[PDB]
Design a protein around this nucleic acid. Sequence first.
DNA 1: TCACAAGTTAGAGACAAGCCT
DNA 2: AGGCTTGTCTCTAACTTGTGA
Lengths: 197, 197, 197, 198
Amino acid sequence: SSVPSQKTYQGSYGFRLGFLHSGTAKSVTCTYSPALNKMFCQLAKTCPVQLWVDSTPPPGTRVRAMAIYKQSQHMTEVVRRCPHHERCSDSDGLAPPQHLIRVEGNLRVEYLDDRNTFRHSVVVPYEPPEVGSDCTTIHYNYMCNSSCMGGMNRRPILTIITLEDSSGNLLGRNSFEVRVCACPGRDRRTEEENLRK
Amino acid sequence: SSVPSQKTYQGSYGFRLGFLHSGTAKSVTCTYSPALNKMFCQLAKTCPVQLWVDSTPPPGTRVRAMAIYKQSQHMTEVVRRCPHHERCSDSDGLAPPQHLIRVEGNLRVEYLDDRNTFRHSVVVPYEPPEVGSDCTTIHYNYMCNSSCMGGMNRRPILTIITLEDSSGNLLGRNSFEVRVCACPGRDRRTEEENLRK
Amino acid sequence: SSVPSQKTYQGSYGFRLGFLHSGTAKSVTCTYSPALNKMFCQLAKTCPVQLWVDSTPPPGTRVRAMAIYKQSQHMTEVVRRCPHHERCSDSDGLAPPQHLIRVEGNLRVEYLDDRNTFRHSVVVPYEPPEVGSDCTTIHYNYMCNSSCMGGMNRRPILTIITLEDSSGNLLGRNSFEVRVCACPGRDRRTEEENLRK
Amino acid sequence: SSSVPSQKTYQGSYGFRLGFLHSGTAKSVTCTYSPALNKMFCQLAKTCPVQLWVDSTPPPGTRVRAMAIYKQSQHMTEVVRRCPHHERCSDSDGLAPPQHLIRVEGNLRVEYLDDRNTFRHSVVVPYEPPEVGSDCTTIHYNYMCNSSCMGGMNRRPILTIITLEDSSGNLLGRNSFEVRVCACPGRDRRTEEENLRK
DNA sequence: TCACAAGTTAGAGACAAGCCT
DNA sequence: AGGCTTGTCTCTAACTTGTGA
Ligand SMILES: [Zn+2]
Ligand SMILES: [Zn+2]
Ligand SMILES: [Zn+2]
Ligand SMILES: [Zn+2]
């Protein structure tokens, strides 16, 4: 219920977000719009999100992803999966059915059903970039189209990536808008070229 | 799931179906296509169906309405409501959430499934035309759009109306196709003008 | 399945990959394209890969070969043999049926299943160049066409050659694209001459 | 290997004949029949209408079996089944076992069979008289693998044997036709015809 | 009554690509 | 090996179809 802050806060470690340049090819599964700060992606397909830091955080550091409705009218409402996809039986064996945001590839992922705020969140332990890399990449999945009747229902959302210590304190925070659709390449091009109005 | 017969059969009482002429307007809620034998109607809106008989059946006679998928590859599936709509709580106080076809106004209505075929059906006791009238009218509601994700899923259906004695024996039968869409007038006009081949 | 990095990393030893000049003469079994960094080869045929290093590594050092899908959409998916080639009598007695990449000769070869990751890989104990030669050559086999239905399914892959300490630490890695087809000479000549567009 | 059922056309005591729909070699058709080749070109999992013609209505309890056998002699004794790939992806009919190549749409009294001795796959429906004004009974068949499926039919042509049987399985009538399951029926039929003459 | 939003589908040739004249 | 075989791409588009000036 209570709205988590979305204010971009790099913190003491210079926590920034990175994405791949994929282009609006109309055959792409996931693309990012720097102008809109928005990720257009297909249902249940891979969403590569990069983590850039000026300095390596202490071990036991985890990262948290949470979805919140963008419009102020809907902010108090928890982001859940539509009743259909919830009973679709597509679980990876790790993620709860109702959760929208999943993490594939990571073995020690945890899924949170917040006792008080009722909000859904997913966490993985932070890992420094492999030797010679510049950043850590996390693959996210979104388990419902933005237009799904019974959940997001054509309401745009934001994904909040939060860097936490082992205790759960805030270290860094960044965010980006997400549209889950059938044609990311088409809808990104359309939406970008509509911003002129 | 064994497929109920759909062959029309007027029987010993000359059981016929009647409909209202509403015309493919722009703001119409329900419209019947004689050429297609198909009823285009909005979600949860009133669908008037008339019952015509040559001779008044014995008392205790019941009228059943059942929905089946028209296409052969889907016939063996039970027609229900989408996971979303069966949880929206729009219940009229009488109908169970998962039933697609409702009857409004009729207090002596019963909502049934079948012991073996598992199919949903709604019944009302047949009442003769009040003196002056030549038929009796039943108001049906369809509680899911034909395109409902998780429900009918863009699959067209047939509504089978059967005249039964108290025991459940067949007395008469008729049927028609149903599209539950947002714009009945538009979609009926489209399908009819597409039949020109 | 943790996504293994394709970060080309020569490390402290200057680990580089070399190949034989075989030419795109139709009727070659295995050829390498320097421009594409891509190896075109026939099914189950010998693929010579030689290892170039500035300084001889300590004994107990091993060389690991692993397959991975090039595209981001499929990167999360493990690389296996098609369901058909899995169950046909191919096994040399050493290699598991599921594994795509195997090593000819080299009796000290080991194939792992990676309980946690589930990713297939094959290892060889590193042996210094024989006297006169300036590199160590390894003969690899690819046990499925790139176009194998149910397997790679026309999706291009990369082979990740990693240099490892016995404990499994990273010393250096390189990678190259692999197309397993019927006509390597034809397909290489075609793909190279298409890059001019 | 597995023994070979006879393919010889035999109309029997009831004049059992096969009928097909005239569809033409369109460039977007899903199923077409070539009278010159006695061959049906069709897409995977798409409906294949097959008609059953009889002179005299046979006794009640008589059945209709459909079975696929390889046409070429060196492959006839091999059993025809779905490729290892298509076998493992749910295509479920709601009825049909995953491994069966030939399916039947609509008919709920369908049975998917496996011979005790020949180990061959076969699909059986109870014979039902023409609902007149039809002069024949039509059956919707599916083929759940392309003829070129690696690990399956593997580009080997096949024959579909339709047999009219009594309750016990005795032969009453038998006809057959060649089947190519491809992506482009209209193209492949037009090609092979324009190759047969002359 | 239109225009838009946002998921599903289609054309036949131009190719991909494995196999056999 | 050249020719052919045979399934896929290209993929806008046009078509669904519910929602909105
Ligand atoms: Zn959904
Ligand atoms: Zn619904
Ligand atoms: Zn294979
Ligand atoms: Zn197959």
